[PDB]
Design a protein around this motif. Structure first.
Motif, PDB file in Angstrom:
ATOM      1  N   UNK A 752      39.612  36.917  21.181  1.00  0.00           N
ATOM      2  CA  UNK A 752      38.943  38.216  21.174  1.00  0.00           C
ATOM      3  C   UNK A 752      39.951  39.368  21.159  1.00  0.00           C
ATOM      4  N   UNK A 753      39.666  40.435  20.382  1.00  0.00           N
ATOM      5  CA  UNK A 753      40.520  41.630  20.396  1.00  0.00           C
ATOM      6  C   UNK A 753      40.267  42.553  21.602  1.00  0.00           C
ATOM      7  N   UNK A 754      39.306  42.194  22.458  1.00  0.00           N
ATOM      8  CA  UNK A 754      38.960  43.027  23.622  1.00  0.00           C
ATOM      9  C   UNK A 754      40.156  43.250  24.547  1.00  0.00           C
ATOM     10  N   UNK A 755      40.244  44.448  25.122  1.00  0.00           N
ATOM     11  CA  UNK A 755      41.332  44.800  26.039  1.00  0.00           C
ATOM     12  C   UNK A 755      41.426  43.862  27.245  1.00  0.00           C
ATOM     13  N   UNK A 756      40.281  43.357  27.701  1.00  0.00           N
ATOM     14  CA  UNK A 756      40.233  42.517  28.899  1.00  0.00           C
ATOM     15  C   UNK A 756      40.233  41.009  28.602  1.00  0.00           C
ATOM     16  N   UNK A 757      40.711  40.630  27.421  1.00  0.00           N
ATOM     17  CA  UNK A 757      40.647  39.220  27.002  1.00  0.00           C
ATOM     18  C   UNK A 757      41.277  38.238  28.018  1.00  0.00           C
ATOM     19  N   UNK A 758      42.460  38.550  28.551  1.00  0.00           N
ATOM     20  CA  UNK A 758      43.097  37.628  29.501  1.00  0.00           C
ATOM     21  C   UNK A 758      42.264  37.449  30.771  1.00  0.00           C
ATOM     22  N   UNK A 759      41.715  38.551  31.279  1.00  0.00           N
ATOM     23  CA  UNK A 759      40.811  38.505  32.422  1.00  0.00           C
ATOM     24  C   UNK A 759      39.641  37.556  32.134  1.00  0.00           C
ATOM     25  N   UNK A 760      39.076  37.673  30.935  1.00  0.00           N
ATOM     26  CA  UNK A 760      37.936  36.843  30.553  1.00  0.00           C
ATOM     27  C   UNK A 760      38.351  35.379  30.468  1.00  0.00           C
ATOM     28  N   UNK A 761      39.479  35.129  29.803  1.00  0.00           N
ATOM     29  CA  UNK A 761      40.021  33.771  29.670  1.00  0.00           C
ATOM     30  C   UNK A 761      40.271  33.122  31.044  1.00  0.00           C
ATOM     31  N   UNK A 762      40.929  33.848  31.945  1.00  0.00           N
ATOM     32  CA  UNK A 762      41.161  33.356  33.303  1.00  0.00           C
ATOM     33  C   UNK A 762      39.854  32.970  33.993  1.00  0.00           C
ATOM     34  N   UNK A 763      38.848  33.835  33.878  1.00  0.00           N
ATOM     35  CA  UNK A 763      37.538  33.581  34.478  1.00  0.00           C
ATOM     36  C   UNK A 763      36.871  32.343  33.900  1.00  0.00           C
ATOM     37  N   UNK A 764      37.098  32.102  32.606  1.00  0.00           N
ATOM     38  CA  UNK A 764      36.498  30.957  31.921  1.00  0.00           C
ATOM     39  C   UNK A 764      37.072  29.602  32.363  1.00  0.00           C
ATOM     40  N   UNK A 765      38.189  29.612  33.091  1.00  0.00           N
ATOM     41  CA  UNK A 765      38.678  28.378  33.706  1.00  0.00           C
ATOM     42  C   UNK A 765      37.653  27.804  34.690  1.00  0.00           C
ATOM     43  N   UNK A 766      36.733  28.655  35.149  1.00  0.00           N
ATOM     44  CA  UNK A 766      35.654  28.242  36.048  1.00  0.00           C
ATOM     45  C   UNK A 766      34.317  28.042  35.334  1.00  0.00           C
ATOM     46  N   UNK A 767      34.309  28.166  34.005  1.00  0.00           N
ATOM     47  CA  UNK A 767      33.066  28.049  33.241  1.00  0.00           C
ATOM     48  C   UNK A 767      32.481  26.642  33.325  1.00  0.00           C
ATOM     49  N   UNK A 768      31.150  26.560  33.346  1.00  0.00           N
ATOM     50  CA  UNK A 768      30.441  25.282  33.445  1.00  0.00           C
ATOM     51  C   UNK A 768      30.818  24.276  32.347  1.00  0.00           C
ATOM     52  N   UNK A 769      31.250  24.787  31.197  1.00  0.00           N
ATOM     53  CA  UNK A 769      31.567  23.945  30.048  1.00  0.00           C
ATOM     54  C   UNK A 769      33.066  23.638  29.927  1.00  0.00           C
ATOM     55  N   UNK A 770      33.879  24.231  30.800  1.00  0.00           N
ATOM     56  CA  UNK A 770      35.333  24.023  30.747  1.00  0.00           C
ATOM     57  C   UNK A 770      35.795  23.003  31.774  1.00  0.00           C
ATOM     58  N   UNK A 771      36.795  22.199  31.413  1.00  0.00           N
ATOM     59  CA  UNK A 771      37.479  21.358  32.393  1.00  0.00           C
ATOM     60  C   UNK A 771      38.917  21.081  31.972  1.00  0.00           C
ATOM     61  N   UNK A 772      39.824  21.145  32.948  1.00  0.00           N
ATOM     62  CA  UNK A 772      41.236  20.840  32.714  1.00  0.00           C
ATOM     63  C   UNK A 772      41.463  19.356  32.419  1.00  0.00           C
ATOM     64  N   UNK A 773      40.436  18.532  32.629  1.00  0.00           N
ATOM     65  CA  UNK A 773      40.547  17.096  32.374  1.00  0.00           C
ATOM     66  C   UNK A 773      40.347  16.737  30.896  1.00  0.00           C
ATOM     67  N   UNK A 774      39.954  17.710  30.075  1.00  0.00           N
ATOM     68  CA  UNK A 774      39.629  17.422  28.678  1.00  0.00           C
ATOM     69  C   UNK A 774      40.512  18.176  27.687  1.00  0.00           C
ATOM     70  N   UNK A 775      41.358  17.448  26.935  1.00  0.00           N
ATOM     71  CA  UNK A 775      42.261  18.069  25.970  1.00  0.00           C
ATOM     72  C   UNK A 775      41.572  19.044  25.007  1.00  0.00           C
ATOM     73  N   UNK A 776      40.373  18.704  24.529  1.00  0.00           N
ATOM     74  CA  UNK A 776      39.691  19.602  23.600  1.00  0.00           C
ATOM     75  C   UNK A 776      39.366  20.951  24.251  1.00  0.00           C
ATOM     76  N   UNK A 777      38.866  20.925  25.488  1.00  0.00           N
ATOM     77  CA  UNK A 777      38.552  22.173  26.204  1.00  0.00           C
ATOM     78  C   UNK A 777      39.831  22.972  26.430  1.00  0.00           C
ATOM     79  N   UNK A 778      40.897  22.285  26.861  1.00  0.00           N
ATOM     80  CA  UNK A 778      42.170  22.955  27.121  1.00  0.00           C
ATOM     81  C   UNK A 778      42.677  23.669  25.868  1.00  0.00           C
ATOM     82  N   UNK A 779      42.623  22.965  24.740  1.00  0.00           N
ATOM     83  CA  UNK A 779      43.105  23.512  23.484  1.00  0.00           C
ATOM     84  C   UNK A 779      42.272  24.693  22.990  1.00  0.00           C
ATOM     85  N   UNK A 780      40.963  24.623  23.219  1.00  0.00           N
ATOM     86  CA  UNK A 780      40.025  25.620  22.707  1.00  0.00           C
ATOM     87  C   UNK A 780      40.056  26.927  23.490  1.00  0.00           C
TER      88      UNK A 780
END
Ligand SMILES: N[C@@H](CCCC[NH3+])C(=O)O
Ligand code: NA
Ligand code: NA
Ligand SMILES: [Zn+2]
Length: 866
Positions: A752-780
């Motif tokens: 995203x070109x949004x100014x707050x993109x890193x903040x959003x990305x950091x928050x998404x580490x807690x997203x229901x669909x994200x997990x550090x156990x899955x290479x595809x999620x990590x890469x995406x």
């Protein structure tokens, strides 16, 4: 970690001819029994040095005698005082549940599966884990019947039984000797799509596609693509499948894309599962490519394998070439060539200009998993394609035939392959071989002269490869340099000299040379490096009008696109410099007019128009510059998009509407029209806000397929449209349960070109669909941020680097292979300004100091900090 060197290759002291494996399977504790028939080839006093990693040794027997003459050392079991021929029995334990690296035998959801390439088999048992040791495998698998109703390994089922306490077993035999990197085992509960393919000669092959329960609705395209692959390899290469069954298993947890294990391919589900509401045209075509790729390895990799890992490109370059030819034959050759050139000039050139630069046949490797690269694969394929260019199809196929005749059933080298091509064709490839041993991108400089008195056209062509971090010495290569000459009417001028025709593929073999052509009746406009005939940087002083002429008149669709790229390059460079000076976009009227002409051309293939109307990516733009300014590049790309959107507003809308399709078909003509429509939508999104918002929201809601839905969603994010947040929430609510579909959403968030993109990305580490156990999620999420959002990753406050360090600190321990993929953007530090370099260097130094630093990261960090 110790480096290994190609020049140190030596034949093994011992061979293994046959191995019989038994797995007593359990996620917590699997017991492996391996009975190997071994033969000594070396000195009578040479010990056997077996590789092994994270194994619990239970026992060692030689001819059923418990053996006392052995020792375990770092990464090895060393066995002394052996007969010339003997039976080795090893029993050991491993723990699939503890395997977060996903190398060896591991858990993917509820399934157990393997990944053995490059050196994963040694994580299963003590073995000669080197690809010049080929053995006939038998595999018996014992497991809980309820948990693991399907027990799969390479080859054919030869035995099965039931046991007490709810266990059962199956035994497999694969008649073809193989290196252990081609071993596979899968255990689990699956839905199975079953089909057949009958080979040309009449061999009936059972096709079986194993997917997680509930995923059968997403399997037919992969099955169709497998059959398409089989037919094409017959038609184009004259190659038939050689076994009775062909199994593919789709797994959610997988570090790479897929794996060519003999008769039992294991695929990342991303390259299998598709239906029209979950997968885009690009996904369909990627599934086609990757299914084909792994199938093509059956000959180029399996029937002929690699003597050692330095020869990786022998199978990867050639198999990538094969997958490109497959895609190009079935689909649009021009679009395939264009996209493969984008990948080369942007991504691969960057790698060849980095601390990780290597020849397609590396000389030095610390961690072999670090060498499954753009260079080995994509440049590897460009080298095979140059052979094809020099030889022609007929001679190339004769070379393929001689290659298999000589090397079928063996492990071979890159040099063996070149020699087969040379011997079959009688084309001298001695100089050509330097492409295997020299890293870096050659720069080819062209100057020209037209002599009206003599009607002669002279090309003065020079080459040089700049030194790379790995090689201080560079020499001229044998560069096939394809040209075309156009008269004032756009007609091709016959190439000739001294009354004889001249081949249009010039052999550029010297540091400097001159080519003279006679009977050139008009000052030509040249098309140079036609179809990207060699993987090189072209330096020619184009005029804008020469380029727009080529966009109009060039015979090959690739040349028309390439001319547009050269035209854009000039103005991308201009406007990046302007950005740095605080000045707005400047673009000559005649440049906008060239793109208007493309939109309104009724004769042009929509597939070609779509690519011309797709601006170079921020990664492609980066390789126009010695020092990369990622913020200037991002903002100039946006400004160029907005300027074209404004100047071409009426034409873009007309073409968008004209290419509407009510039916959705995964068919090349339909894909082309849709690619053009969505290319127009991209510009329209960056036009007048209200119209943009209406157009985009409407397409998202009315789309009858994921291609059109995602194009709209992507545009809403890119242009920061009012509807963005609503659409992104709607997609999450609909799709959160589906990881592959959510990957697309994570990519949009991360880029995203949004100014707050890193903040959003950091928050998404807690997203229901994200997990550090899955290479595809990590890469995406994380990978896409660092690699595909360089403007945010390279934020001047250094916040991007700090975030990546945090993520890599986790991944170094969890999954070093994924960690190594993700560190790549950080090792490019020398391409950046001094202030950024110092922050990136600081980040790398922090990582260098990690407790238990993986070899994967060590190799890259040490090169980057040198
Ligand atoms: N041979 C596989 C890749 C293996 C990756 C090993 N780390 C392929 O070409 O798809
Ligand atoms: Na085609
Ligand atoms: Na000139
Ligand atoms: Zn491959």
């Amino acid at each position: 970690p110790q480096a290994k060197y190609r020049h140190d290759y030596r034949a093994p002291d011992y061979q293994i001819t046959d191995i019989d494996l038994t797995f007593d399977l359990d996620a917590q504790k699997t017991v492996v029994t391996a009975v190997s028939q071994a033969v000594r080839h070396g000195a009578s006093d040479a010990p056997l040095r077996l590789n092994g990693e994270d194994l619990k040794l239970v026992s060692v027997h030689i001819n059923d005698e418990p053996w006392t003459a052995w020792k375990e050392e770092e990464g090895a079991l060393v066995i002394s005082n052996l007969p010339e021929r003997f039976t080795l029995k090893i029993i050991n334990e491993i723990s699939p549940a503890a395997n977060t690296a996903l190398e060896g035998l591991y858990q993917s959801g509820d399934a157990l599966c393997t990944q053995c390439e490059a050196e994963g088999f040694r994580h299963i048992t003590y073995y000669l884990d080197r690809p010049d040791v080929l053995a006939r495998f038998t595999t018996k698998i014992i497991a809980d019947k309820i948990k693991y109703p399907f027990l799969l390994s390479n080859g054919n089922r030869v035995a099965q039984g039931e046991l007490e306490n709810g266990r059962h077993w199956v035994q497999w035999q694969d008649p073809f000797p193989k290196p252990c990197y081609l071993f596979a085992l899968v255990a689990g509960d699956f839905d199975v799509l079953r089909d057949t393919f009958t080979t040309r000669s009449g061999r009936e092959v059972a096709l079986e596609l194993y997917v997680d329960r509930g995923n059968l609705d997403r399997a037919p395209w992969a099955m169709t693509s497998l059959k398409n692959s089989m037919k094409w390899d017959e038609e184009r290469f004259g190659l038939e499948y050689d076994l009775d069954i062909y199994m593919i298993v789709a797994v959610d947890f997988f570090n790479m894309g897929a794996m060519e294990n003999k008769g039992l391919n294991i695929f990342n589900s991303k390259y299998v599962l598709a239906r029209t509401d979950t997968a885009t045209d690009k996904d369909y075509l990627d599934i086609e490519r990757v299914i084909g790729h792994e199938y093509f390895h059956n000959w180029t990799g399996n029937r002929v394998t690699c003597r050692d890992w330095f020869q990786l490109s022998l199978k990867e370059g050639l198999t990538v070439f094969r997958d490109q030819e497959f895609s190009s034959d079935l689909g649009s050759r021009a679009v395939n060539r264009i996209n493969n050139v984008r990948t080369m000039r942007g991504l691969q050139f960057a790698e060849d200009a980095s601390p990780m630069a290597h020849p397609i046949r590396p000389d030095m490797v610390i961690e072999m998993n670090n060498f499954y690269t753009l260079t080995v694969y994509e440049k590897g394929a460009e080298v095979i394609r140059m052979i094809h260019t020099l030889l022609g199809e007929e001679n190339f196929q004769k070379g393929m035939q001689l290659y298999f005749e000589r090397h079928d059933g063996s492990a071979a080298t890159c040099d063996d392959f070149v020699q087969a091509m040379e011997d079959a064709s009688n084309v001298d490839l001695s100089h050509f071989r330097r492409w295997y041993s020299q890293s870096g991108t050659p720069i080819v400089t062209v100057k020209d002269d037209y002599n009206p008195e003599t009607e002669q056209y002279t090309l003065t062509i020079s080459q040089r490869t700049p030194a790379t971090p790995d090689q201080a010495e560079k020499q001229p290569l044998h560069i096939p340099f394809a040209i075309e000459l156009y008269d004032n009417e756009g007609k091709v001028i016959p190439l000739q000299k001294g009354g004889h025709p001249v081949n249009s593929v010039l052999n550029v073999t010297q540091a400097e040379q001159t080519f003279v052509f006679d009977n050139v009746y008009f000052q030509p406009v040249p098309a140079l490096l036609c179809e990207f005939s060699a993987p090189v940087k072209l330096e020619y002083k184009w005029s804008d009008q020469q380029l727009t002429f080529l966009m109009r008149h060039a015979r090959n669709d690739f040349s028309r696109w390439d001319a547009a790229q050269s035209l854009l390059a000039t103005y991308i460079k201009l406007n990046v410099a302007r950005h740095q000076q605080g000045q707005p976009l400047s673009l000559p009227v005649h440049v906008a007019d060239a793109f208007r002409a493309v939109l309104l051309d009724e004769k042009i293939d929509p597939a070609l128009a779509a690519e011309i109307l797709t601006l170079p990516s921020v990664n492609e733009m980066a390789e126009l510059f010695d020092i990369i300014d990622p913020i200037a590049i991002a903002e100039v790309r946006e400004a160029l998009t907005r300027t074209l959107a404004t100047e071409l507003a009426d034409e873009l809308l007309a073409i968008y509407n004209a290419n509407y399709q009510s039916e959705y078909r995964v068919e090349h003509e339909d894909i082309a029209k849709r690619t053009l429509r969505n290319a127009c939508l991209r510009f329209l999104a960056f036009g007048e806000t209200h119209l943009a918002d209406v157009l985009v929201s409407k397409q998202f809601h009315e789309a009858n397929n994921m291609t059109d839905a995602l194009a709209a969603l992507s545009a809403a994010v890119a242009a920061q449209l009012p509807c963005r947040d609503a659409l992104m929430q709607e997609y999450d609510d609909k799709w959160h349960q589906n990881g592959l579909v959510m990957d697309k959403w994570f990519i949009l968030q991360a880029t995203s070109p949004a100014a707050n993109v890193l903040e959003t990305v950091r928050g998404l580490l807690q997203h229901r669909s994200f997990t550090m156990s899955n290479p595809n999620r990590i890469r995406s999420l994380i990978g896409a941020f660092a690699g595909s959002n360089p403007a945010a990753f390279h934020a001047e406050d250094g916040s991007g680097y700090l975030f990546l360090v945090e993520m890599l600190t986790d991944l170094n321990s969890r999954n070093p292979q994924v960690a190594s993929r993700l560190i790549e953007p950080l090792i490019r530090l020398k391409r950046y300004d001094a202030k950024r370099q110092e922050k990136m260097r600081a980040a790398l130094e922090q990582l260098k100091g990690l407790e238990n630093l993986s070899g994967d990261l060590y190799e890259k960090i040490t090169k980057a900090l040198a």
